[PDB]
Scaffold this active site. Structure first.
Site, short mmCIF file in Angstrom:
data_model
loop_
_atom_site.label_atom_id
_atom_site.label_comp_id
_atom_site.label_asym_id
_atom_site.label_seq_id
_atom_site.Cartn_x
_atom_site.Cartn_y
_atom_site.Cartn_z
N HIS A 1 0.79 -1.23 0.00
CA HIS A 1 0.00 0.00 0.00
C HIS A 1 0.83 1.30 0.00
O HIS A 1 0.28 2.38 -0.13
CB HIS A 1 -1.07 -0.01 1.11
CG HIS A 1 -0.55 0.31 2.47
ND1 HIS A 1 -0.33 -0.65 3.44
CD2 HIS A 1 -0.23 1.50 3.05
CE1 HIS A 1 0.12 -0.08 4.54
NE2 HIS A 1 0.18 1.23 4.33
N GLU B 1 -0.03 -7.77 1.01
CA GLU B 1 0.65 -6.55 1.42
C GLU B 1 2.16 -6.68 1.31
O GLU B 1 2.90 -5.75 1.68
CB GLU B 1 0.24 -6.14 2.84
CG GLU B 1 -1.06 -5.36 2.88
CD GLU B 1 -0.99 -4.08 2.06
OE1 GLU B 1 -0.28 -3.14 2.48
OE2 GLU B 1 -1.64 -4.00 0.99
N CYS C 1 5.02 2.27 7.60
CA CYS C 1 4.77 1.13 6.73
C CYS C 1 5.95 0.86 5.79
O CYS C 1 6.51 1.79 5.20
CB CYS C 1 3.50 1.35 5.93
#
Lengths: 171, 173
Positions: A30, A54, A129
């Site tokens: 993402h 992911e 992230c």
């Protein structure tokens, strides 16, 4: 953790990525730029891209980080062990977070079910992230996940893993 | 043998690099400093205490910028004849610590700009354009100290010059 290890941690899109070797870069899906035709100045046709949920892996044709040696990429973190999330903050500060890893399973992240692994922080923000989860094996470091999510509670974090299929079973 | 937090002090800046000496103090080499701007790291220039001469630029900010950091001593020039390390960061993320034996301090004009410089010889790649601002450091006991910032390099490749923060004990008789 040696400086070289931290030098693998790289700003990428809205988060971070990690050089596993001179040609291999892993990150969290993402955070990957969507409107682009190049990564790090290399055209997509030059890059082998493997995305599983992911977890995103790039293998470049060109040696992007020839200064680096390859290291082991595991399919998930060893359950029950303490790993470190190598977080870099925008100021440049190094913020390694110790985390006790738990089960590997499917989790809902960014509105999709993906293979992930929870952990307990022994906090992170959305901009973290892609940060790698690593641990020491012998005298060497190994990478086993990339930061994907965290509870609002904060205490638990989740990394995306390369392969989680069937790691825990109902009893 | 430089620890990660020491490298974490090396910071991309303008057309080169700079170095957090402490939570409030940042040093860099003058010619790489961005011009025509109103702030650095979100802080208005008017709030910055600035000490700049001979290509050596020092900023002291009015609030803690890197509170995670310990304060290091900034020496006035490197110790002559001793071996220092230039902490080079490349845009790729690569770390390139270069050992360098330090030599003479002299004031000089390089490509038109006044440099309070110290020559050194690389012990052996080398420095390249874009590396200016990288810190020169060494150990005093169990502590790291910083003594200059990368400024220039000789065609022969093997000699480099850092800007240093020294008093007028570098001007010719």
């Amino acid at each position: 953790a040696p400086p070289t290890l931290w030098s693998r941690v790289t700003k990428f899109g809205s988060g971070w990525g990690f050089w596993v070797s001179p040609t291999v870069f892993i990150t969290t899906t993402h955070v990957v730029p969507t409107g682009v035709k190049e990564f790090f100045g290399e055209p997509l046709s030059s890059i082998a891209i493997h995305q599983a949920g992911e977890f995103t892996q790039f293998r470049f044709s060109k040696k992007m980080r020839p200064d680096l040696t390859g290291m082991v990429l595991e399919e998930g973190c060893p359950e029950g062990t303490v790993c470190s999330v190598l977080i870099k903050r925008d100021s440049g500060e190094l913020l390694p977070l110790a985390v006790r890893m738990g089960a590997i399973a499917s989790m809902r992240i960014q509105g999709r079910l993906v293979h992930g692994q929870s952990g307990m922080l022994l906090g992170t923000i959305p901009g973290d992230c892609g940060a790698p989860y690593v641990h020491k094996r012998g005298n060497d470091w190994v990478v086993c996940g990339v930061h994907a999510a965290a509870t609002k509670s904060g205490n638990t974090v989740v990394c995306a893993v390369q392969a989680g299929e069937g790691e825990t079973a109902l009893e």
